């Protein structure tokens, strides 16, 4: 067929200059992030609940209101668990859905399962409510250059529903959303009309957050396929310091450090992993401290430093996609 | 409904005095153990084998002969092999099998088949006659202090027969003995009456002791829900460091290092995890020197070593139970 | 020359509970820190200058006006240097002079020697204002606690003069107040009446501050003597941490790192090492990369960096004296 | 004083865009080097000796050739030493009578004193041959654009004599070229008529290369006031590499890595460096294997570092340079 | 002179077999060390006191007890201090006085001077008593080999006193008897009636002893001139480890890893090293936890490590010495 496909693993960044990055960096608010975005999100919202609809109209309202032209679609669905049949809704936000290539940031806006205890409620701030926040607060801070869009390639956000187990992190019982997703993905033909290219040829690279908004981290090269790419961040995020862009910073406590790792981690990316779509891991190594536990609130986010990403991230995809 | 397979989330350890302590490492004594529990392991072991039976046997007496009301099974079951239909027995001593939550200590009873070399038999000292004895070690040491069990928990521990391979490693070829105890146990409702809970629930921690007794080791933090309790050893091992309880030791090679491990070791603990047991996997990396080779005996054992990990293990399973 | 110099030898600290350090965390304030005790030091003020007077002027206000009967001196002297003879002056703020054993804080007050650039200023904000605020946010935040001092132990501010080189780092031109103090106190009977006994003798421990106030700082343990002092700023760094009691904290971003050091900082610790009193130097390694240029601002100060350190200094502080 | 002593402390450089930099790469021909510049230097040449004078005699000869207005200079001496005195020779070769401020690089050019051994004798190819001729070439290189000097900054290079010692390193026996030159400067105004000011003031960094020419060399970032000088390298570095213009290199093979040193090596660099000289030490951490021994040879040198290095000079140097 | 004196520059080593490092193992043994070497070093022994003759005296014993022909001085001398004159006597052992060369092993005899604490009193087991007795021991072990001195070559053992400071370490107050016999040594001429060679022409190496004794020692490659019998010294600890010929070891915690150091440790070296002879500094990096506390006792030492670095010394002097 045509080679569009292969399109992805030829393709360069336009690397921005210094007042690029100085605007990119004024251009984003951690505050407004944090008020308008993020807070909405800090509930207990497990699929099903009240709070999985809360928060998931939360995301299409904050993204309906933009100026660019963001194709929201849920896609419910039903799965077995270790409970029965639940239901289950993975949100897509899409620009230019006929753009046969597309850029994709991803993470997870559900909530694992506890039970109260002692009257506390685990809402999972950095699992993963941070980095729905920041596709959030990318959205909006590059909404003017974004419209540009009225190389065939634009930018897709996934939310997946269901990435955490019920009872107990099998292979079972985890990622209903992103294992759904991959699947009517691969057998979605792309183009339309298409006669064998699917939904996820056209998949560039696939950037997963999850799990950042603690203090420190340190996020690990996992793939050769999409490791030019992590280095960009190493780039990007040495730029941006050697610039002033960043606070309370020091490149020996860099983020992204030239430091690939050993066995794999299990994460809404392994549907896409394994059918062949590069990926981006953007988790941290270790994890966060408060990891599955009642203390992953607010008080324990570093506010600094997910500015410091939002900044890094913003600027990764500009580049990626030529604004 | 009774959410009292989640108490163990929530579980702290009451930690111990620095007279408490003084107290702990003054009542192990290596030696004894050396000469009581372990030189009797120390033989050609493999399942079916004489020594099997013999080993067997020597575990429980040493069990049977201690004051607390422990209760010994020999899950005796048949299993396929490379070499036909097989037999294995494993050994499950418990206290107080009503204790609805219990913490388990565990190894593998059996040593590997290999044939005979310059008169040479292989007899697994580290590969894991050490470990067997250690938990045996410490059962007597303990013994006048898990009498007080009769939150509603207790400790038991178990011995697996089988979890070499007979020819050649793999999941078809392996842990027969845990396997089968993993199945057994997931589908045996605890407790008594119970509906919807299985033993497995009642599992708090399970610490797996393997490859135990060489120079140097080096134990990595190898799962992030058992990551605090990794913690409590790093913890222990520093106070009866500083308070010098421990021979021959230095913080320059401690036992737990702060490093975390990439990838998954195979072993009992795997029936268990993915089940959804936590995991404290106490096997070192890199694996002993002599690993699997005839050299796994008993000259090569360092003493001081494993008499610090009893204590050590002691101090943690003291706190664990809040005796 | 009795035998009282060598109790430094066997000093102890009296650890504090979990509850003692909760008040220490609560009361100190990084913001009247921030304002009161540093804002006011940010000027030009090398050695002669008027604001050498001036900052000069303020500490000893920040200090007259607390309860603990603090007794200044001034220790005015004159020196060569590469611009001619120049005059200097320590500020020595003792807490029971009689008190004959003292554990001494200290930092260097001047600002080096540099010709305006773009009309900007070198003001030192990490080289050393943070250092002298810190030092007098810890005499504040710990007055209370300190007016119990009328063992014989007290504790001693210095804030050194001169320490920066005018021209060129050299023995000639560097540290032209504690070379000049050291030799000082290293003749002059301690306590009065002495006869074999110097000042220094009675100088248990000298916790040398500086170039603290950048993010991501590490600090080593340089000496032999006095690493188990080292060590309990690993231990309070990590209880605080456990705590919950930092903020945007990380363990695998510690700041006292077990890490040995080979070559020597040259720093005003210099002669009174060499006159063998025991010397932890907390001054990070690397340097603050605004080290000795216009931005060692405070725009580029870590706020909460320094509330960190504030709180284990005000805490080791306090188990040092037994309070 | 006047202000110009401090303009090298807020010197940036003219960064060099692609184009330019393959400009450069391209400019270099290690060949051209390795043959002209660098075999006739591989002769015993300690001092006094005929390899001194014709080694002396080459290094000129390569400079006269050269279009630019090079100002040569011996300064023959006389010290002192261990074998009675002896007389030494220094070669200067510099641009611009009056550059007020001046980049050095400079390089020992005498060769350590061994009696002959299997009929071998001592060379240095890297200590410090390869260095020398590193520094020809890249006058060579770079005359056409170093024309271009008739900011009052220009170039200098020297070529210390006496730097090994004749028995037994110590002070009184090393670095004889060296301590006399810069006692020497230390000592001349500069700029000519000055009343306050030293050829010292003038020298903004000293770039002084030894022991290079071995295979995998590491340099670590010696000194804080000429880390920001260590960072460009770096940068060079990379970006050389990014382009495909270096051979044999990958970044798990980098030279310059960011690894400070502890404690200090004595090189010809000592003299400036307590006379406030600010000073780039490219010396490698470890020395190299053949480093005093008649192994130090061509044979034993890697051609694919130094083509390397050169271009990474070179370029560090035009970018010094605003040219 | 002549090039007798650079013969230590080309020395090549005899290396030993397998079967030959076999009969060296059985040839040590710690046990009888342990008894009659160094428990009798075990005692208060600072310079003058009793326990100084006591063992001094004591060396001297266990020397002349064996057969090889040892050639015992005794350097007794007056030396300024805090305190006063003093009297201070080394212990020199010769094999060969007029042998030109002389591999020298040297540790130190003396004890630091500690009041008594709780009844507790300082006797400096690591420090350096161990020392001493490796070097006793080394010497009843090879006896029959060493005779075979009837290479102009042979060996050299010395204990120094006073190398502790009196009050506090520095210049002034230290290595009393290396200064004292490092410049008396060259100062006198060898072989005798030579006219420009001194004995410490014919200090081939120095193999200085210090801080030996503890778990887990690590010593670092210290000087360039020295690091090919360094890494003899990591070849010997090798293989005796690969023929099971080293007791409770692993390569994972090697004795000598090829990491080189930064700065410098004073110790009884320095007074030969700033005259040029060849150093190998057996002294730990880290030190001991106990040095210079009261813990520094014999209850603390590791036996299994001194007995396998007894094996590696007794090893590398063999080899040196072509026996
Ligand atoms: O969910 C989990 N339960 C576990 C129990 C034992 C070991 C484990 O690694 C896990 C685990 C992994 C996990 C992986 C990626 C995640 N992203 C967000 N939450 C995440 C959790
Ligand atoms: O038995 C084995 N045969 C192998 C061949 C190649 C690679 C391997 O990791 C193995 C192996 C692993 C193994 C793992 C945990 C064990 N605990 C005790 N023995 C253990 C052995
Ligand atoms: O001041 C300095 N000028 C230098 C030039 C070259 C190398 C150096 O280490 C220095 C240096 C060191 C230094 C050390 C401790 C200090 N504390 C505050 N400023 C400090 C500076
Ligand atoms: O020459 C030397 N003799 C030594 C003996 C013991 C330790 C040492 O570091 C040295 C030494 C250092 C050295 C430093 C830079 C050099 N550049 C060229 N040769 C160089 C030598
Ligand atoms: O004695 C000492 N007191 C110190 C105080 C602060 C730092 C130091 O490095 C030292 C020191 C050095 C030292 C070096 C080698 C020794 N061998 C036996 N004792 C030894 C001691
Ligand atoms: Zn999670
Ligand atoms: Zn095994
Ligand atoms: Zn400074
Ligand atoms: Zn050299
Ligand atoms: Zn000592």
């Known amino acids: 067929a045509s080679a569009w496909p292969e399109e992805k693993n030829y393709h360069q960044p336009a690397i921005l200059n210094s007042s690029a990055l100085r605007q990119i960096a004024e251009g984003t608010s951690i505050s407004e992030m944090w008020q308008n975005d993020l807070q909405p999100l800090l509930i207990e919202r497990y ?3 009240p709070g999985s609809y809360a928060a998931r109209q939360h995301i299409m309202q904050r993204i ?3 100026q660019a032209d963001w194709v929201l679609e ?10 029965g049949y ?3 809704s993975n949100i897509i936000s899409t620009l230019n859905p006929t753009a046969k290539r597309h850029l994709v940031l991803a993470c997870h806006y559900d909530s694992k399962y506890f ?9 999972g701030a950095t699992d993963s409510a941070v980095p729905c926040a920041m596709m959030l607060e990318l959205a909006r801070a590059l909404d003017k250059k974004l419209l540009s869009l009225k190389p065939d390639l634009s930018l897709q956000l996934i939310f997946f529903d ?14 209903y959303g992103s294992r759904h997703l991959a699947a009517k993905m691969a057998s979605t033909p792309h183009p339309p009309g298409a006669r064998g290219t699917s939904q996820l040829h056209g998949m560039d690279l696939l950037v997963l957050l999850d799990l950042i908004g603690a203090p420190n981290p ?8 999409s490791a030019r790419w992590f280095e960009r961040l190493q780039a990007i995020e040495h730029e941006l ?11 020996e406590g860099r983020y992204f450090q030239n430091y690939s790792y050993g066995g794999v981690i299990q994460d809404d990316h392994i549907p896409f992993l394994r059918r062949g779509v590069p990926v981006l891991h953007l988790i941290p190594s270790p994890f966060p401290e408060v990891w599955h536990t009642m203390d992953d609130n607010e008080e324990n986010l570093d506010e600094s430093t997910i500015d410091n990403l939002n900044k890094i991230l913003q600027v990764f995809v500009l580049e990626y996609l030529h604004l």
């Open 47 to 49: 699929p099903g609940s």
């Open 64 to 66: 309906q209101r933009l």
């Open 74 to 83: 849920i896609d419910t669905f039903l799965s077995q668990t270790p409970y």
């Open 86 to 88: 639940r239901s289950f």
């Open 115 to 123: 039970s109260h205890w002692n009257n506390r409620v685990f809402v």
């Open 162 to 175: 269901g990435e955490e187990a019920f009872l107990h992190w099998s292979p079972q019982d985890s990622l």
């Open 218 to 225: 340190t996020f690990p090269n996992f793939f050769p396929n």
């Open 241 to 251: 310091h050697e610039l002033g862009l960043l606070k309370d910073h020091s490149l």
